[PDB]
Design goal:
- It is built from 26 helices and 11 strands.
- The protein is of the alpha+beta class and 652 residues long.
- Strands 2-3-5-4 form a 4-stranded mixed β-sheet. A 3-stranded mixed β-sheet has the order 6-8-7, covered by helices on one side. Strands 1-11 form a two-stranded antiparallel sheet.
- Strand 2 and strand 3 form a beta hairpin.
- Helix 2 packs across helix 15 and helix 5 runs antiparallel to helix 13.
- It is globular, with a radius of gyration of 26 Å.
- The structure holds zinc ion.
- Keywords: Hydrolase, Metal-binding, Metalloprotease, Protease, Zinc.
């Protein structure tokens, strides 16, 4: 049964599109769908996220319906799911599955044993004091190398630990109370629970101080520092890297990528000088917190009170199956994804999507060649890169081998650690081997898409090829406004403030003249400042620097897909549908992707942690730089969407 191209009932026609295009296209849906207790936000995207997750739920119920042999993927999935859903067993076990892990931390006797403990835990997939992983060399994209990265913080953005205003201090104290509660639930007395929470926050705050900001983490060249391992470790011996690497079985490692180099220089003296008891309590708190979703309901409720009620504003938890399905999809996603495509993905969608992608690619080449600010040399290298895109649609051509993953069924938490151990070992085995450029970094059932610089690939999972993005019964204008913009957005990531640094082979090599690079940086700075002047809440501005790459990609996707849409329309009589011109339907279909309600807590949280602008701004601000949108709705200077021409910023 065909799905309507545009859900007209979501539109609020009492709002002029020239004044508030977001609420013209979405306002009635927003009025009629106040957020339910368990949702921090909801709207077009989350509707498709939810409907796809329910498909995966049915797939899990199908695989869990039989009894299978150990060592089959069906057994792995069913056994993780069954244990996650067994509330009675999880509640009877309580904190007992955690006890040996805590005793091992309590037994750490000196700083030397602290180093060996970090290696032992990182060998299981942990990130005890810092991150590490194996992935392509940014300067040799055919080779896998070892990378080390700054501490991962529980609140994500380091600013949570530092910012000096009332709301920030309140959040910090609520986090400490969460640590106190789970320490009590793990069996510590009142005095120890207070001590652990206080010391853990102290230690994590000191690490946050020496971390890079979210903005600085996006700087491509700043966060690549390849060197001989021993050149660094001969000099910085406050943390005993030689013992750590030996216990990681990495003493054969000649070179590595020290991504946040100034973090590790400061970590050298922090680790040498930190109080041993305080470091121990930091480890206890991280271990309890990392287990809080895998034990009894008390632990999940304590975690919900902070990460849900406090940080996101929700008042109830989602049904148990949603978290359980999400968990199996994160560990065995390609096993689920193979079933998903066989059951739900029609072959005609892949063929039509490939035609659309090739149309967008042609339009991007046309757009670049028509630029008047870019010289001929840089244009030619830009054409070489866009002609070299790797295009991945629907699903991979080979499926991941999960045969080494040991799932035993003794306890939920125990099997989570085994699945995590498998993922870690699988990553480590890539070291020193040729990079697999065909691998997917998302699953077919993920409602998302991505660009990868080190492969120059664009990837569109089966799950995003659904309405309102891709609708095989819709008119072309609406599909270009939806999935067409998504395609152009991923393509523009190859040319944003990060992607432009990588060439057609995925190598971090400069292909820009100095003049053209300076013009790009000047214009990108203006787009950052433009968004940074918009308020998202009372006294809270958008972060135009953190969202710069995504706002460039949105703008490029709008410009490229519109050109592709006009190219496809050449030589056709324009026909109005629902009284809208095709040009207008392009923009309405784009804006319908973003309609949502969102709690004020969640507005603040996403501003701190999300590189994507809020849906409202991806419509009402992004379109203010699009000449075609002014033309489609004849926007005039007294209209609220209008931005003075000298203040518009067009990067591509
Ligand atoms: Zn993006």
């Amino acid at each position: 049964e065909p799905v309507p191209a545009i859900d007209l009932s979501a539109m609020d026609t009492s709002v002029r599109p020239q004044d508030d295009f977001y609420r013209y296209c979405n306002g009635n849906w927003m009025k009629n769908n106040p957020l339910k207790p368990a949702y921090s936000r909801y709207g077009s995207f989350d509707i498709l996220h939810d409907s796809t997750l329910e498909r995966v739920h049915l797939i899990v119920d199908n695989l869990a319906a039989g009894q299978h042999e150990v060592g089959t993927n069906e057994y792995r999935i069913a056994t993780l799911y069954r244990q996650a859903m067994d509330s009675i067993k999880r509640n009877k076990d309580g904190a007992a599955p955690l006890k040996e892990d805590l005793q091992k931390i309590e037994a750490i006797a000196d700083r030397a044993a602290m180093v060996k403990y970090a290696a032992a835990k990182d060998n299981m997939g942990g990130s005890t004091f810092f991150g590490s992983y194996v992935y392509a060399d940014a300067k040799n994209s055919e080779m896998n190398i070892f990378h080390i990265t700054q501490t991962g913080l529980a609140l994500d953005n380091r600013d949570y630990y530092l910012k000096q205003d009332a709301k920030s201090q309140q959040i910090r104290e609520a986090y400490v109370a969460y640590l106190n509660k789970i320490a009590k639930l793990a069996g510590y007395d009142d005095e120890a629970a207070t001590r652990i929470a206080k010391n853990a926050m102290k230690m994590e705050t000191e690490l946050a101080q020496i971390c890079y900001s979210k903005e600085e983490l996006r700087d491509t060249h700043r966060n690549y520092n390849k060197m001989a391992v021993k050149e660094f470790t001969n000099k910085y011996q406050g943390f005993d890297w030689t013992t750590y690497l030996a216990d990681r079985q990495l003493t054969t490692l000649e070179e590595w990528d020290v991504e946040q180099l100034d973090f590790f220089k400061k970590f050298d003296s922090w680790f040498a000088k930190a109080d041993l008891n305080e470091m121990r309590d930091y480890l206890l708190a991280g271990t309890i917190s990392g287990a809080a979703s895998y034990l009894s309901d008390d632990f999940e409720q304590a975690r919900f009170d902070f990460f849900g009620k406090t940080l996101s504003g929700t008042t109830e938890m989602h049904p148990r199956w949603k978290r359980s399905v999400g968990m199996v999809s994160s560990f065995l996603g390609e096993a689920l994804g193979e079933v998903y495509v066989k059951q739900y993905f029609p072959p005609e969608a892949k063929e039509r999507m490939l035609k659309l992608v090739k149309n967008l690619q042609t339009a991007l080449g046309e757009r670049i060649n028509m630029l008047t600010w870019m010289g001929d040399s840089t244009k030619m290298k830009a054409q070489e890169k866009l002609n070299s895109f790797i295009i991945k649609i629907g699903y991979p051509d080979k499926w991941k081998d999960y045969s080494k993953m040991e799932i035993k069924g003794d306890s939920y938490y125990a099997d989570i650690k085994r699945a995590s151990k498998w993922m870690h070992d699988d990553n480590m085995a890539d070291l020193g081997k040729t990079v697999d450029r065909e691998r997917w970094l998302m699953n077919p059932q993920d409602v998302n898409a991505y660009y990868n610089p080190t492969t120059n690939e664009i990837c569109f999972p089966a799950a995003i090829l659904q309405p309102p993005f891709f609708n095989m019964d819709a008119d072309d204008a609406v599909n270009y406004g939806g999935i067409g913009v998504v395609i152009g957005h991923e393509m523009t990531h190859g040319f944003d403030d990060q992607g432009r640094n990588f060439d057609k082979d995925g190598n971090m090599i400069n292909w820009w003249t100095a003049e053209d690079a300076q013009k790009f940086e000047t214009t990108a700075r203006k787009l950052a400042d433009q968004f940074s002047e918009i308020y998202v809440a009372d006294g809270v501005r958008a972060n135009g620097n953190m969202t710069l790459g995504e706002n460039i990609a949105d703008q490029g996707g709008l410009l490229i897909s519109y050109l592709a849409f006009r190219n496809a329309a050449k030589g056709e009589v324009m026909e109005e549908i629902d009284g809208f011109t095709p040009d207008q339907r392009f923009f309405i279909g784009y804006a319908r992707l973003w309609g949502q309600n969102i709690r004020p807590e969640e507005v603040l949280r996403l501003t701190q942690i999300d590189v994507h602008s809020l849906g409202e701004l991806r419509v009402n601000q992004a379109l203010r730089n699009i000449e075609a949108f002014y033309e489609a709705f004849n926007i005039q200077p007294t209209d609220k969407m209008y931005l003075e021409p000298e203040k518009r910023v067009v990067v591509w």
